[PDB]
Write a protein that binds this DNA or RNA. Structure first.
Ligand SMILES: [Mg+2]
Ligand SMILES: [Mg+2]
Ligand SMILES: [Mg+2]
Ligand SMILES: [Mg+2]
Ligand SMILES: [Mg+2]
Ligand SMILES: [Mg+2]
Ligand SMILES: [Mg+2]
Ligand SMILES: [Mg+2]
Ligand SMILES: [Mg+2]
Ligand SMILES: [Mg+2]
Ligand SMILES: [Mg+2]
Ligand SMILES: [Mg+2]
Ligand SMILES: [Mg+2]
Ligand SMILES: [Mg+2]
Ligand SMILES: [Mg+2]
Ligand SMILES: [Mg+2]
Ligand SMILES: [Mg+2]
Ligand SMILES: [Mg+2]
Ligand SMILES: [Mg+2]
Ligand SMILES: [Mg+2]
Ligand SMILES: [Mg+2]
Ligand SMILES: [Mg+2]
Ligand SMILES: [Mg+2]
Ligand SMILES: [Mg+2]
Ligand SMILES: [Mg+2]
Ligand SMILES: [Mg+2]
Ligand SMILES: [Mg+2]
Ligand SMILES: [Mg+2]
Ligand SMILES: [Mg+2]
Ligand SMILES: [Mg+2]
Ligand SMILES: [Mg+2]
Ligand SMILES: [Mg+2]
Ligand SMILES: [Mg+2]
Ligand SMILES: [Mg+2]
Ligand SMILES: [Mg+2]
Ligand SMILES: [Mg+2]
Ligand SMILES: [Mg+2]
Ligand SMILES: [Mg+2]
Ligand SMILES: [Mg+2]
Ligand SMILES: [Mg+2]
Ligand SMILES: [Mg+2]
Ligand SMILES: [Mg+2]
Ligand SMILES: [Mg+2]
Ligand SMILES: [Mg+2]
Ligand SMILES: [Mg+2]
Ligand SMILES: [Mg+2]
Ligand SMILES: [Mg+2]
Ligand SMILES: [Mg+2]
Ligand SMILES: [Mg+2]
Ligand SMILES: [Mg+2]
Ligand SMILES: [Mg+2]
Ligand SMILES: [Mg+2]
Ligand SMILES: [Mg+2]
Ligand SMILES: [Mg+2]
Ligand SMILES: [Mg+2]
Ligand SMILES: [Mg+2]
Ligand SMILES: [Mg+2]
Ligand SMILES: [Mg+2]
Ligand SMILES: [Mg+2]
Ligand SMILES: [Mg+2]
Ligand SMILES: [Mg+2]
Ligand SMILES: [Mg+2]
Ligand SMILES: [Mg+2]
Ligand SMILES: [Mg+2]
Ligand SMILES: [Mg+2]
Lengths: 252, 130
RNA sequence: CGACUCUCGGCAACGGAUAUCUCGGCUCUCGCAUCGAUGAAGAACGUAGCGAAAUGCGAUACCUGGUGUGAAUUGCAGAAUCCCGUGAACCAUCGAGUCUUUGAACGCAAGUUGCGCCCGAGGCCAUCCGGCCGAGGGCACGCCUGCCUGGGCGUCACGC
RNA sequence: CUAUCCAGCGAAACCACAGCCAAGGGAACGGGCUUGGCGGAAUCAGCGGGGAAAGAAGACCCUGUUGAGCUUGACUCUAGU
RNA sequence: UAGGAGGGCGCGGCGGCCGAUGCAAAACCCGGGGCGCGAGCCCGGGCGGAGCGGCCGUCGGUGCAGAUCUUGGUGGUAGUAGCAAAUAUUCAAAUGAGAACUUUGAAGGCCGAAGAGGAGAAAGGUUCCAUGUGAACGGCACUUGCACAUGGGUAAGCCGAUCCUAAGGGAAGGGGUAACCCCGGCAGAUAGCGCGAUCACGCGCAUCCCCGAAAGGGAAUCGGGUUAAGAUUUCCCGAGCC
RNA sequence: UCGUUCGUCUGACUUGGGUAUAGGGGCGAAAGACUAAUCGAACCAUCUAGUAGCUGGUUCCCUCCGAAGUUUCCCUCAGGA
RNA sequence: UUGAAACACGGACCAAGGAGUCUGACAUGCGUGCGAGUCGACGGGUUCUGAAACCUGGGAUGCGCAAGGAAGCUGACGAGCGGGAGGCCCUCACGGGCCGCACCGCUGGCCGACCCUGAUCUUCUGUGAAGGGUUCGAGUUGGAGCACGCCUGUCGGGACCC
RNA sequence: GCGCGACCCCAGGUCAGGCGGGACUACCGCUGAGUUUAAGCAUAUAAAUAAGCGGAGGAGAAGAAACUUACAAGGAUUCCCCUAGUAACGGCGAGCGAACCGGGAGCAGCCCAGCUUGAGAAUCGGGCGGCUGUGCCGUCCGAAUUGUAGUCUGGAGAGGCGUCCUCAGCGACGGACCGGGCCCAAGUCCCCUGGAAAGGGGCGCCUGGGAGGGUGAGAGCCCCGUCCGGCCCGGACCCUGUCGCCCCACGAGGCGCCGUCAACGAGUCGGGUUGUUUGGGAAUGCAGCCCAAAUCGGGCGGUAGACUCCGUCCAAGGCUAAAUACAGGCGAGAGACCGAUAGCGAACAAGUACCGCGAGGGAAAGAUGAAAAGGACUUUGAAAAGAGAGUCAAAGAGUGCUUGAAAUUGCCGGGAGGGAAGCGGAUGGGGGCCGGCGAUGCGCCCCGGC
């Protein structure tokens, strides 16, 4: 967030002073002088016209909040896990009825593309282009004050391409497409892996990024991850199939 | 998308730079697309308009009406052209304003400096076409 | 039935809330360092074909000049060669110029366009080869370096 | 000369809703509550019983760990001599 | 009741998802139809003419009947109180759409010259004069006006300022002061030097600056004319004065 | 403020202009009078959104639970632990 | 307010604005991550829409893992009982026995302050075999803590508004 | 009846020159309150703050130990984190409150005065003159011996010896940094509604360009722009990159040794007392007055005191970027902010109109339409206006004109009323409104073809 506040001096650039009691009017401060309509009008209240606001907004609010580094990492792990489950992506709102396999992984030949037409053509072999079109035709002006606070157009979310060879040109080939985002594999971002707080961004992994996702996040072993002091969280259940638990021979 | 951190993407500042522009800038904004054939000839897509160009409004309520420009009226963001004109209640005749982006320059008033401008805007387009 | 009162709807008023806006504000961030005795900031008065304000400018007065762009200004009129050019423009920009009375304000003062003194381009006649009318321009305060003219047996040497 | 009427012009204080009484009960003096008396459109000009009428966050008194002016044998300081 | 908690309704953003909208969005109005116990919601019709809603997460300048609350509007009071000092107006005629209020004439009256007359100081600043007038204003009215609009007008050797001092005020050197600022006789080669001579020099320098009065002191002007508005003495005519 | 009736009217008289004294200061033939409708301490801005145990107000629905004016201490009794 | 329809005060009516918010410290409760650890918060490298994000250090920075004393200083030598959830074993079962977390109650032990005590050894002033205590500790015989978020409460700030 | 020189001081409209005032964010110095808190209040707190008075810059200030520490010690200044709400200070009450260590950002150290040319002021300024021109050179005056230049600064240094090692300038051409200008992809194709196509359908295209803005309604492709970069013009440059000519000394430095000297800042330190301030407590800084030094010495080592030892530094002269601050100014960029009673007081001729003698106070006020196409003309009226008409998609959007709420008023239609009305619960009578207000379809059968 960027900070926002009212002026330190709002409402307090009038030199008013209450009339006191005995003038058949309330005891609120009133502007001095004469010759204007402003003379005798209330001031310095938050109830006045032209006075303060109650408890004025100040720049030293808590704008930025802190989350533990290990909790960010755990959350990125859960978001990556949720990218792999087709029902989660489809629930989350991506048109995937024609993508070949999950997790959707394309060859490194994608890394070399340069042009946006080439990126579209690449999406055509895959099933992503239904989603990309969904964003492209769902772009529309943001309702409300956002259409004058420099937040004119909104759109949907399209596939998130992840690449492994840094300095590749797919970052520039895919940029112009509305709703489609491109990430590097070292620095995954939660705002992309789970927009809106909802799980299951439709991620398209390139073949370079996919094979080093293990080298980056590691496994259930100390120091296996490229990140220090981090191992994958373990779930509170190994198998979450209540059907199989309850209907197992032991339980039944 | 925008990468240069010197050009504003603010609606307020852009509307300032538009509606407060001086005449030397209003000329550049008063640009019109060339006709398809004259585009084919001069290898340019748009040109700022002149005193005596032949324009052919394509989208106003006066579609299809060819007319020479008679008064490019930079204050009200309009141009007055021959005979594309209406009648007041009393019967006086007044030229209407058509925004320059709604006309196409069918025939062009070749000044020598215009020839130079067409050369520059031609080779700029084509040196990046090739 | 009718008048009056209360009341419901329809329509009309008064009034400008709400709804949609916004060349404005606020907040954060970044780059730079540039006023003035070579007269600043501020103030006053003027200045446009038709202007009062605001914006601009200073008796060259909503501008002069160079450069850049390249055919306008515009509410009305007008002159416009101003059009393949030494070139329009309430255009941009900045080096050449102008910059009224004031104001630290500086000849003296100031409810005064008050009262002075000096130089002096230029002209007149000759009371001389001098004087009169001048265009302009000086004349403040403390201070430094130097120079000029000076003062005091403050210390002296030499002298009548 | 006004006040009254007429032409013309034309405000303000004030206003919870409003305006007939008796007795009772009640925050111990009700326009509203209870039991009665009654109660018939709409206006005119007065008047000063009432509306515990308007004017004013009572000045009389008290409370305040609020002041202020003044005094002195109050407490702590100070110019001056 | 004071109070506490839970679940929800509603306003405005942000990250997401699903949508509506020139075949009519937002808003607002309705003796329209419903849903919920309720906050509230959904639909219908009209005006409207360009945007808007729903769900999840989350955030907030988030919900009004009071505060002699603040700003703006509107009522009843109410066509009511009221418009009453300064004696007084009346009749013809003219203009005009329109006259108790304008203009001319006539008559009656008042001010009664320590005035309701003729001029000035300060103050005002164009109110002065002419022509025209839709509105507003002149607490009734208006053809009218000190109103609105466009024009015009203020002439100085002699009238004043300017000059000199009064009470007093500011100040150069100096004394004080943290510095702005405060003291002027404190005596300092004092602000200024002066006069005769320049064909140059001599003599003097004493209570030593500036400001301060349109009622103090004071170089000089009178008469007659003249303009829509200037002048008595500002212009013209004559005659003077410094 | 107006009307009538009054006080003084050659004097410690009435008055214009100039000028001096400016806030805990001025000035007072003394009333705490006057110092620009303000005076038992002017007015303007700022510290300042002064403080308040005191008065007034404190914004949506439903469901559920639901009291106290009593002890002890306090310059403590309108208050707080 | 014990008590309001009150002859108690505010309210003529309408529309819009209008009053427990922000920040710091602390605390309980709850959620999440890790868990004798936990925080990357000041910096550094990266960052092709980005004040974001990601990486980095820490071998001792904050808190926590040790406390008692004013201080010099010293600094936990290892726990039993009664009731207990729950499990287990025996019986046809009723009933009986065993292990018994948490928590509650009881008694102790060890560290330290104060007191008391004193074999040996030792650098003669130190140690400390044994024995202690109607004393005191915010101790130990349970490692649970750190960080973030939310509400509530106390306090400082204008601090619910006038 | 003198001529001289020095000192000290005059007056000069002398020649040449520097000063004063303005802005307030940030910065430096002085001065300096109280409201408040302590539930009173007087020390304390507010606060070493607000106000007052001055002074600068792009940053200012500080800065190269008379430091801290007690360590295995480190090593200028400034800022951030931690130290730490801790030690300390406080009617030990309210409260207040730093530093060392450590980690980071950036790091650069320097020059004077004194003993030191004495064959000899080697120095500096000014007038004039020249040239190559931010200076150099010549000449003449002056400053100066009461000391200019050079060497030196404690880490040293001066001397003496030594193989030795180290030093110079001018050109070009860029890069780099800054400003400016110009240029740069793609539909305006067909149909429909529409006043307007930027809407819907269909057929297509660009995208290293779908930031934003304009254009007659939701415009990637109409326009300005955005991405990639390209081109050219001008600046300061004083940073380095390579080329070219110029060849680095008997001077200076460094290094090694020697042992002889070894010079170091005064009403200053330091001490008493007073006042203020601090966390600084037998006194943290500062300041006034008095006392007033030291050279085998002086200041520190957070409890005053004397002695012994130890750790440490060298004041009383000066300069110094970087990291840091920034409601002012100039130029930019962004926003989970405000949307005309909001947000700056000011969206607008807002610090304006207006008030006050003056210090000062100080508002209100935004929206026609796509385009004025701003209503010709006819007629009633004295006129404003009305009624027809016309422009427009609509003017009932008609110059305070987008929509147009309630309060409140009028007219039309209905309803009801014996000193209130309104409201709750019953229905009843009027209205007004509801066809999802209320159905006609299922099974069995026979054709007649589907
Ligand atoms: Mg009243
Ligand atoms: Mg405001
Ligand atoms: Mg009448
Ligand atoms: Mg009664
Ligand atoms: Mg009553
Ligand atoms: Mg009754
Ligand atoms: Mg009457
Ligand atoms: Mg009556
Ligand atoms: Mg009466
Ligand atoms: Mg009465
Ligand atoms: Mg009272
Ligand atoms: Mg008390
Ligand atoms: Mg008192
Ligand atoms: Mg006493
Ligand atoms: Mg609020
Ligand atoms: Mg409201
Ligand atoms: Mg209200
Ligand atoms: Mg209420
Ligand atoms: Mg009457
Ligand atoms: Mg009367
Ligand atoms: Mg007389
Ligand atoms: Mg008279
Ligand atoms: Mg007149
Ligand atoms: Mg009238
Ligand atoms: Mg004089
Ligand atoms: Mg006089
Ligand atoms: Mg006189
Ligand atoms: Mg004459
Ligand atoms: Mg009288
Ligand atoms: Mg007098
Ligand atoms: Mg007088
Ligand atoms: Mg008075
Ligand atoms: Mg308050
Ligand atoms: Mg107050
Ligand atoms: Mg009470
Ligand atoms: Mg309590
Ligand atoms: Mg009572
Ligand atoms: Mg009563
Ligand atoms: Mg009361
Ligand atoms: Mg009332
Ligand atoms: Mg640790
Ligand atoms: Mg047990
Ligand atoms: Mg609070
Ligand atoms: Mg107090
Ligand atoms: Mg108190
Ligand atoms: Mg008190
Ligand atoms: Mg200050
Ligand atoms: Mg400096
Ligand atoms: Mg700590
Ligand atoms: Mg303090
Ligand atoms: Mg283009
Ligand atoms: Mg189309
Ligand atoms: Mg657009
Ligand atoms: Mg002080
Ligand atoms: Mg002291
Ligand atoms: Mg310095
Ligand atoms: Mg907001
Ligand atoms: Mg406003
Ligand atoms: Mg419209
Ligand atoms: Mg519109
Ligand atoms: Mg309207
Ligand atoms: Mg209504
Ligand atoms: Mg009656
Ligand atoms: Mg009823
Ligand atoms: Mg019924």
């Amino acid at each position: 967030r960027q900070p926002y506040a009212v002026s330190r001096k709002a409402g307090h650039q009038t030199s008013a002073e209450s009339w006191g009691t005995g003038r058949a009017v309330s005891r609120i401060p009133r502007v001095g002088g004469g010759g204007t309509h402003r003379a005798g009008q209330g001031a310095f209240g938050n109830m006045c016209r032209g006075g303060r606001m109650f408890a004025p907004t100040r720049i030293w609010r808590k704008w930025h909040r802190r989350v533990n580094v290990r909790l960010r990492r755990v959350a990125v792990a859960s978001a990556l896990a949720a990218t792999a489950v087709p029902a989660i992506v489809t629930a989350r709102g991506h048109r995937i009825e024609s993508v070949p396999e999950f997790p959707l992984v394309v060859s490194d030949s994608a890394e070399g593309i340069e042009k946006t037409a080439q990126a579209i053509k690449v999406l055509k072999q895959l099933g992503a282009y239904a989603d990309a079109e969904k964003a492209k035709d769902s772009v529309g002006i943001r309702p409300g004050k956002g259409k004058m606070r420099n937040r004119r157009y909104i759109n949907r979310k399209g596939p998130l391409i992840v690449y492994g060879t840094e300095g590749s040109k797919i970052v520039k080939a895919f940029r112009n497409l509305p709703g489609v985002d491109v990430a590097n594999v070292e620095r995954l971002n939660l705002l992309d892996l789970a927009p809106g707080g909802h799980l299951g961004r439709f991620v398209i992994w390139t073949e370079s990024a996919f094979k080093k996702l293990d080298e980056v996040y590691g496994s259930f072993e100390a120091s296996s991850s490229k990140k220090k002091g981090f191992v994958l969280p373990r779930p509170k259940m190994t198998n979450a199939d209540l059907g199989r638990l309850i209907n197992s021979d032991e339980v039944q | 998308m925008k990468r240069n951190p010197r050009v504003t993407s603010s609606r307020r500042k852009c509307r300032k730079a538009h509606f407060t522009a001086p005449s030397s800038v209003r000329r550049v904004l008063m640009s019109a697309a060339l006709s398809s054939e004259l585009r084919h000839k001069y290898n340019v897509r748009s040109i700022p308009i002149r005193k005596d160009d032949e324009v052919q409004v394509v989208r106003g309520t006066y579609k299809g009406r060819e007319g020479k420009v008679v008064q490019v009226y930079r204050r009200r963001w309009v141009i007055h052209v021959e005979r594309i004109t209406r009648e007041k209640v009393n019967g006086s005749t007044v030229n209407v304003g058509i925004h320059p982006s709604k006309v196409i320059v069918t025939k062009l008033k070749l000044d020598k400096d215009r020839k130079a401008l067409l050369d520059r805007k031609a080779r700029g387009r084509a040196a990046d076409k090739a």
